[PDB]
Amino acid sequence: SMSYTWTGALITPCAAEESKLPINALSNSLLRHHNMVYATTSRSASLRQKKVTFDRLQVLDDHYRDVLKEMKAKASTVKAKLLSVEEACKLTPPHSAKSKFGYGAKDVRNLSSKAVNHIHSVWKDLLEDTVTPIDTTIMAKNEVFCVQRKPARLIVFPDLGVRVCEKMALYDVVSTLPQVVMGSSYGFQYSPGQRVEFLVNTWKSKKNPMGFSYDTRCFDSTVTENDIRVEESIYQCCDLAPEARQAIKSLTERLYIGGPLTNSKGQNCGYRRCRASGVLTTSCGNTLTCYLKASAACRAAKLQDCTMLVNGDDLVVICESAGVQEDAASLRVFTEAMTRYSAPPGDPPQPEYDLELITSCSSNVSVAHDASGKRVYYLTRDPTTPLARAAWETARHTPVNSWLGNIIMYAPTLWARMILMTHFFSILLAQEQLEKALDCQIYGACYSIEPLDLPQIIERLHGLSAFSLHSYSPGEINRVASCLRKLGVPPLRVWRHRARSVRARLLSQGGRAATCGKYLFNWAVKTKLKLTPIPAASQLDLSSWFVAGYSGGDIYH
């Protein structure tokens, strides 16, 4: 069966699209090599269409059904609640795409009589009809990258009224089921610190550790009707209200398994028979299906003492090495099993015996030292894409502030501290916009965050030591330095100088502003202050930040 079929109508934009890096008076201070930064546009949709369109075959064996039985036994212990219309409305992002039916994201959030009545009638239709495919819009995403050019990614989503209904039937399920099912292998339950801790403690629990990441080529396209019906059977093990069972069956048949594709102008583009990337279950569905295939593939491969780490389509395995020749042979069998299961690799998997050389979720463990000289593991990544996007965001307001999400997720890193913090605090100060709440995304969900709150956020997520890491690894330093030469970003010595200034500028204003000065930029002074817990930190509500992923899920936290 083919992942998609097309009519030959084009995937169309719904607004002006820029591909070329916009330049303003601030650009050059961050990045000189402008022509290396670009955004994807609908003009490359055609190329993406060819990549994501193929035939899927699937051959399911006893290892597969064995892991599924287990997954189902654990799912059966979950009790999930239906959300009210009101609860589902408050989870809607203020800037979520409006409905074709005369109300938008703000009408929903306000419980306007029109939004609510439409939601009620879409809900009602879900209960009455488990057959008619639900319409979706297919769009090309505008995303910013550094060259070496990718084609636009595609997003496929139903109407707003449908999205609210999805939250009602499934929010509690997608938030609570995957950790019950997958235990410590479910990646989205951890903050980046907790994730590094889980990986180190897993690497260490092996006599002779071996690990690998596994990248499925176009994972969403590899998701078959079988896979999506199997996800449905797992959801349906939960102790649910009968009305919820019905809405879930309905959304599965009419939306999750497939449906017609419509462009921004109302033309039929074709039909989908694979994972929709802009539905509530995209993340949970991908995590379960990836975990189910991979667990069964470990058994086929006879890997010893496997520990998986799964975040949607992103997969890490750590196990007991059987020796280097045996390990390489085992990975080949794993890949064969994965592929029979319909999930062939993009890049063939490579066994690693060094934890820091495994990249998953584009990220890796590394080490630096705290104030006391002690070893600290933290999560980092290649900064090329973060810096490319910071340049873009320097010159344009965008819906999502990746610079802010990167500061939060990668606060302990040399590149987030020296460059991202320094640059954006200078920009914010000069506009007196430190208090202005900004939208960013973390594990796919949307958050509205005042820069002035960064210090307490970072402390909670990463702890105090994030403000005093130093003595980064040669490998990390070399990768950062190499990325700055590529993009023509000023060298770290310039950034320290700038940070002193930005730091001095912030200390003046006192209050929260001075706290950012003191905590964020303490690395920039020769004689470091002492950093002590910030009071307003445990007063903040952060539980609920790392419970589940919601990539494509239209979730506001």
Ligand SMILES: CC(C)C[C@@]1(C(=O)O)C[C@H](C(=O)O)[C@H](c2cccs2)N1C(=O)c1ccc(C(F)(F)F)cc1
């Ligand atoms: C500011 C970004 C860090 C936010 C972004 C998001 O999901 O919306 C987008 C990121 C991306 O495009 O690499 C990242 C990921 C999303 C999906 C896989 S990795 N994102 C993450 O939140 C993320 C950061 C770190 C990790 C890790 F490595 F801790 F598991 C997983 C996911």
Ligand SMILES: CC(C)C[C@@]1(C(=O)O)C[C@H](C(=O)O)[C@H](c2cccs2)N1C(=O)c1ccc(C(F)(F)F)cc1
């Ligand atoms: C090879 C040098 C780049 C290493 C040096 C060291 O002592 O550890 C010396 C630096 C110094 O001159 O301040 C710096 C620091 C050491 C202790 C606090 S900051 N160091 C750093 O490694 C460092 C550079 C940059 C950052 C930043 F900005 F990301 F916080 C933190 C730490």
